[PDB]
Amino acid sequence: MSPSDFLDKLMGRTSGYDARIRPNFKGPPVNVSCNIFINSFGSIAETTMDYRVNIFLRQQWNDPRLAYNEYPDDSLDLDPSMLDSIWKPDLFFANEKGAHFHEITTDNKLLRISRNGNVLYSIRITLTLACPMDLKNFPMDVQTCIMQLESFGYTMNDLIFEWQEQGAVQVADGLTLPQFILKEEKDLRYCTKHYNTGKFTCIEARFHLERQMGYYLIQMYIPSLLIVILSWISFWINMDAAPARVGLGITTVLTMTTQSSGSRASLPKVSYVKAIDIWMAVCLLFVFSALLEYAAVNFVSRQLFIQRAKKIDKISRIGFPMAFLIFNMFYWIIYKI
Amino acid sequence: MSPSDFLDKLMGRTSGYDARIRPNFKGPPVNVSCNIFINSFGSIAETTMDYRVNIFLRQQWNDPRLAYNEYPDDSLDLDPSMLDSIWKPDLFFANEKGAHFHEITTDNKLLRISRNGNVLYSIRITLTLACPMDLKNFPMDVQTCIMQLESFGYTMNDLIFEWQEQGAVQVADGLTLPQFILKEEKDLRYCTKHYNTGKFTCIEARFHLERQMGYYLIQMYIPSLLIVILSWISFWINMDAAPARVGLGITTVLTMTTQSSGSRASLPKVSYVKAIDIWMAVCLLFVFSALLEYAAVNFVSRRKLFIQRAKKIDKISRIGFPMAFLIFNMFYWIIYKI
Amino acid sequence: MSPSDFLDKLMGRTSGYDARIRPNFKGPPVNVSCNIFINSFGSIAETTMDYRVNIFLRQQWNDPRLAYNEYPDDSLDLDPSMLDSIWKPDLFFANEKGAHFHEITTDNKLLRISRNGNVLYSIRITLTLACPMDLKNFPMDVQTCIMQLESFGYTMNDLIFEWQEQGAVQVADGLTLPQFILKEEKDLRYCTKHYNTGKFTCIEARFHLERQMGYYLIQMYIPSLLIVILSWISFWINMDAAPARVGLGITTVLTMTTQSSGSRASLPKVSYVKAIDIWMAVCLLFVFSALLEYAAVNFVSRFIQRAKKIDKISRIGFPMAFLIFNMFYWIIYKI
Amino acid sequence: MSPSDFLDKLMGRTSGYDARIRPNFKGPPVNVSCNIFINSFGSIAETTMDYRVNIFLRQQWNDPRLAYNEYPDDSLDLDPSMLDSIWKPDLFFANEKGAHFHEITTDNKLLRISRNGNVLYSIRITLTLACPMDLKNFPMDVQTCIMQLESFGYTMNDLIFEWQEQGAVQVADGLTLPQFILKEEKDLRYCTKHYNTGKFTCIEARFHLERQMGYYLIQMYIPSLLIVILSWISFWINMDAAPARVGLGITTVLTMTTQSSGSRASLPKVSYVKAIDIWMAVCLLFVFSALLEYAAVNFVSRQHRKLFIQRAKKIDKISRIGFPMAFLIFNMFYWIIYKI
Amino acid sequence: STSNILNRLLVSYDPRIRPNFKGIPVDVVVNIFINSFGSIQETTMDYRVNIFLRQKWNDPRLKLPSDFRGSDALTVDPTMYKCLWKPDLFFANEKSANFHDVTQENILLFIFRDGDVLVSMRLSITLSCPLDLTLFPMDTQRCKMQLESFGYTTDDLRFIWQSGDPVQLEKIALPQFDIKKEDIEYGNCTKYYKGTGYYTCVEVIFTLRRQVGFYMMGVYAPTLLIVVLSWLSFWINPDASAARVPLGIFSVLSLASECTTLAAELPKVSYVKALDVWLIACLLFGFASLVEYAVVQVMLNNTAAKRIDLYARALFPFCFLFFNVIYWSIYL
Lengths: 337, 338, 335, 340, 332
Ligand SMILES: *[C@@H]1O[C@H](CO)[C@@H](O)[C@H](O)[C@H]1NC(C)=O
Ligand SMILES: *[C@@H]1O[C@H](CO)[C@@H](O)[C@H](O)[C@H]1NC(C)=O
Ligand SMILES: *[C@@H]1O[C@H](CO)[C@@H](O)[C@H](O)[C@H]1NC(C)=O
Ligand SMILES: *[C@@H]1O[C@H](CO)[C@@H](O)[C@H](O)[C@H]1NC(C)=O
Ligand SMILES: *[C@@H]1O[C@H](CO)[C@@H](O)[C@H](O)[C@H]1NC(C)=O
Ligand SMILES: CCCCCCCCC
Ligand SMILES: CCCCCCCC
Ligand SMILES: CCCCCC
Ligand SMILES: CCCCCC
Ligand SMILES: CCCCCC
Ligand SMILES: CCCCCC
Ligand SMILES: CCCCCC
Ligand SMILES: CCCCCC
Ligand SMILES: CCCCCC
Ligand SMILES: CCCCCC
Ligand SMILES: CCCCCC
Ligand SMILES: CCCCC
Hints:
- By secondary structure, chain A is an alpha+beta fold.
- Chain A has five helices and 13 strands.
- In chain A, strand 11 and strand 12 form a beta hairpin.
- The longest helix of chain A is centred in the C-terminal third of the chain and has 30 residues.
- In chain E, a hairpin with a 4-residue loop joins strand 2 and strand 3.
- Chain B: This is Glycine receptor subunit alpha-1.
């Protein structure tokens, strides 16, 4: 009748139940269905190939040794201090890279006991998972950051995890992402892998992340074509201000070089060619061609000749914008596969 | 008579009191009114979408098992050593992004006991709250940062949270913030929500916080003003000094590009348009147009009748552009100051 | 005779001395004497608006339950491992922003017992105090940071703190501070404040801090003077070819802009106008007036005697104004 | 028949097994075979002479006191809560520079018992080991960092470590590194050293790592060739208005110096010359030679007919025909020499 | 069993009391290993060291009886080490430090016949040492590591440097500096704290003389390049003014910007530095080039300024040569 006596006789010293032995010992495996609840995404980075999530984690299984028939009510809750006195799964995260509990005024742990013997256990933890970030089409990128969940000290012939089909990965509404939005649909498959000591149950939930074009698009695309049209208006200058034209052209080259250097320094070093880097390269090539053909037309003007130089200048003036526009159209169509 | 004996008979071994059972078990829910005392803000940064606070925290409730009638005085102070021997709530912060206690020379926790059984429990903790910042009119930003205070393992039928409305958010007197001053108003409502495990109580407070433009005024707008005045002095020069005037033009463009790049560094990468950026970009377009019109007038200059027309056009530009910049400045400021 | 038996009969299980009760219960408060001793400052940074110190911490009081008259020696030490066996105060720090202990090879904690009943208890602690930093006259600044030592879980009528008079805040001899030297004079005053739950004892220890001009002086003022004399030599050029003078002026205004941008990277963002920033603004205005003057004289040229006359008048009058403003500013921010 | 009682009678209180006693005391040493399993490299940056790794760690040895003959089955596992209750080795990493455990929802440690008496104990831990970076041929770098494994509280006369001959250093499949790559061959030798207090067993495992050229190749070598071609077109520019070519050369020098400064910062402070600072310095001296050649031709032009102007044009075309060949052959030597 | 001897040794043994409490102060010796002397950071005024601390002291209560074996040495585990008594020891100039528990706490126990015992706890350290940042490129820094007790006094406990290895590892391979001599002077730093009395000390310094390579190759060559561009400016026709002035003002801008950037890297010291004065001399030389060209133009406009220009371009280079010669000679 006494709740403290009831708790002690259910688990503890005066119970005959040992927390150090897995349920149904020398028998069928233990399922332990688990579902996760996102509570705050974000703080994602790229220089370190990781993202940080503060999530819940709720496990569901049935322990016959914990069956009770005293309290008429079905649902029942327990002080989290009781948790260490009963058996627990050894769930851990494969791509872990640092995680910890939260001890603010209490170890934030929930324990619920069903009448039959089913048990629900939850815990709030914060993780920093490692994601194989791929940056081929960096401005127009789509990524699959994953979390691998598996047991460590139990062979899968004794323990195998599942997910409750009714929204196992339910996600809070108010959460939002800087330079990102996650998609509603979330895949769910298995990752059961083997090691030299056997094979362990592995489960995983993969997320799809989409980065908005806006920030990168505006803040670094716009100066590119801005300086491109600066070169365009530089063509309209005549031959007399040759030092002025060459100085402005080389300074535009400086602007492209420094903007490209900043763009590269923002993003971590990668061997495979990125996407926007071809944009900086092509703008640098266009400004270089502008300066080169201005120098060439000056040389041919010094070396009839004036009319031909003017004709090639107007041909360049009518051609370079057309080539730039067709290149932009080609780029945008080719990076929307 | 002995205080140690009284403590032992009240809680501990020879008391029959178990800290793992909530008061009024299997009955009415418990009332837990709590107040938050602010002690220091600071280190609020937009780079990581958060702010750090160091606050006190006091809960209030009355466990009937704790009632006593031995010591005549109503008040009764206790060593926080006994704290682990009594029942506690499971209070925690939803958006807290890691936090800790202060273990300096002791565990700085105060427990107070009233004659009727009312108990006061206080603990000093330091948090790093995640604030969903918005940066639309960021130069004149006004903010609403919250702290979702909620229980974890107790539903509606078991535990409730309220506020001591008399100074619930009692704040320290002399505190202040860099680039920030907070208003005396503190809104107060409930975040009450549900999960698949049930529903849990909320109480929370939101602090209206705004950033004063002072530093941002000096560092951001003044250099742009200087560069654009340089653009008008570029207008003021004649046409035969083509290398000089155009070099001034591109060099002002360099100042503009470097300034625009520098301002972007502090803020996080956000897709939606900011408020400083439009200022920088539009007066960048002003200096760009300055260079464009100088190039155009040079082209017009290159039998002699159109020279007077070119000079007249230069005068018209040199007159209109200051007026256009001033009217635009007034228009932009009146939009973003309202 | 037996040390173990003596310790057991003094405190612990077979002593009746409970560590959960403060001395002289239901009686007069404990006066308590507490003093600190610095070991090292360091890391004075305005970016985070705080600083870290490494100090000791000593308390003094008398516990009647700890009275003993067996060992002839007055002074008596004890093993730090049995610190928790006896009562201790709850001396914490108001604004502290996170600390720790030193656990190297032992908890570096010292406990001493006096014959009459006085007890000495010292722990080496490393703090990180938040300081209400001010930057009005930044290069010539004088700073005063504080540590609010006080109790937490004991009311003022139950517990008070006090300082031992002779050298309460004695400091190490050879320590030095980058960008700073503290003065030997340190004040001492009470800070007994109130809360809705009651009121508590509170003590203060404030340090006067002065920052040397040297680093900022050289690395900021010298380049500014170099750019001003660049502007002077720009004046000295003939009017003839515009590009040389105009480009020199442009280079100087770029130097001003770059130095203004780089100056404030270390300093924290503050709304109120600083002291160095007004110098940057005024030298930028000097070079701006130089370039505007050259634009005006170019307009006048395209009267040559008037142009050269006004050029000479500017070249002679500008240095006088610069010198008088320089002296005015330095006396204003030095007195 | 109670499963818990077998654990107590095998080890613990009601067993007589003193965990403070190593197996086979006052006798032959213990072989203790061990093998590791990498899970994820990463955060290997030269700025701190170190890299972070996440590996498993398993020990194999035979304990006669742990030998048992009551369970019919061969294999036997145990709850990780009793790991401290039995004796364990004192394996530690000599170079450590920060290490810890994983304490998420449990202490993720595994122990297994063999029927004969041999034991299996595994643990996953995270390391940040010092890697003695050598930056001689930095763009074409080859580098090995050794993971020192040894005992501390047992002399090698009583404790020995050895590797499983069959795949002791078996590695995961899907792992990859940012602009690095680890080769399949991985040496495995001994490191048993001495001290003033004695000598201890010490096993060694070393890796061979390469860095893909691509990133550094493009990001730094492209501007060099760009400035070379820009100096070439500066040569192609005629000599009537000095400030044009003067400013072009000045801007090229600015590009070289700023790019060299930017390359400097990421790489850590070192005394001996690197492999790409030599590239940067030689490109800087080519652009300096370009500006000096322009200064020389300007001096020849204005020293004062056109006979010496003809010689100035001749030296201009000589430079135009020589610098390309010299630059190409120098690049051939440069690239060939550091690839051998 | 074999643990009976140690269990009997520990029973009726009080770790709360140091050996010979009423006797003479206990005698301690130290052998500080140096395993991984980490990189030093000037901006933090700190450096990291990884040591294998070793201590020995007589303990009559820890006398191993000859009844079992009379072993020359005996070994037990860290749990027994925690059970036994230990000498407290805190590092004076320590500011952040911890232990190592990669598998368990690293402690070794050797128990001798006499009663002397040996312990060793590896423990990573980050120290503090006030850098004499003056003469920065040519400096020999003295960062000191000292030990002293806290709870016990000199009349109760004392430290002595054992006549043994203070330096240990030969393959240190420090990134920047290098260590040749490790002499112990001011070894005893017996310290007094008011109201506590005498505390025994043992102290050792590490003498680290910085090399020159990085700074010699990273800054000095750019300075020389800027100076030779200025010399070429001296070798330009004074008639032109849209080229000579712009390149010179660019050179002085670049030199000043490099000066500011390099000065921002070191900790903000409050006195002059060698690199500072080098950059200052270079900057005033550039400004001298600009002002002499301006003077030449002024004289040319309404004697000839060409002779002055050639005299300057012939004389000042030698001035720079022997000035930097004097600089290097005086700083070496
Ligand atoms: C786990 O659930 C699956 C459902 O198909 C089934 O194998 C069985 O019910 C459970 N396994 C156990 C209890 O070992
Ligand atoms: C306080 O009293 C009871 C406690 O269970 C609760 O039902 C009630 O709603 C609480 N609030 C009041 C009375 O305002
Ligand atoms: C201690 O109590 C108060 C508080 O400091 C003080 O005035 C008094 O003199 C002291 N002694 C006694 C016996 O109260
Ligand atoms: C392995 O252990 C056995 C028994 O302890 C010993 O005889 C043998 O020498 C050991 N092997 C090695 C290589 O040390
Ligand atoms: C320190 O003093 C002790 C005795 O007082 C002596 O044995 C030891 O050699 C001294 N060490 C040094 C470095 O002077
Ligand atoms: C990932 C390879 C992209 C190649 C793009 C080529 C575009 C040519 C116009
Ligand atoms: C006492 C030193 C004053 C500053 C000297 C600066 C020399 C460039
Ligand atoms: C969505 C991108 C559109 C670009 C048009 C030029
Ligand atoms: C309070 C806003 C002031 C703005 C001044 C330009
Ligand atoms: C609010 C700042 C004003 C500064 C004027 C120089
Ligand atoms: C220390 C500053 C001196 C200034 C003299 C004008
Ligand atoms: C000319 C500067 C004088 C300063 C006196 C404090
Ligand atoms: C603080 C005084 C400023 C004076 C500016 C002329
Ligand atoms: C792979 C060999 C390349 C040689 C280039 C000159
Ligand atoms: C693989 C080396 C390529 C070099 C091209 C210039
Ligand atoms: C040892 C210094 C070498 C410098 C090469 C440019
Ligand atoms: C591998 C980078 C692209 C070269 C043209």
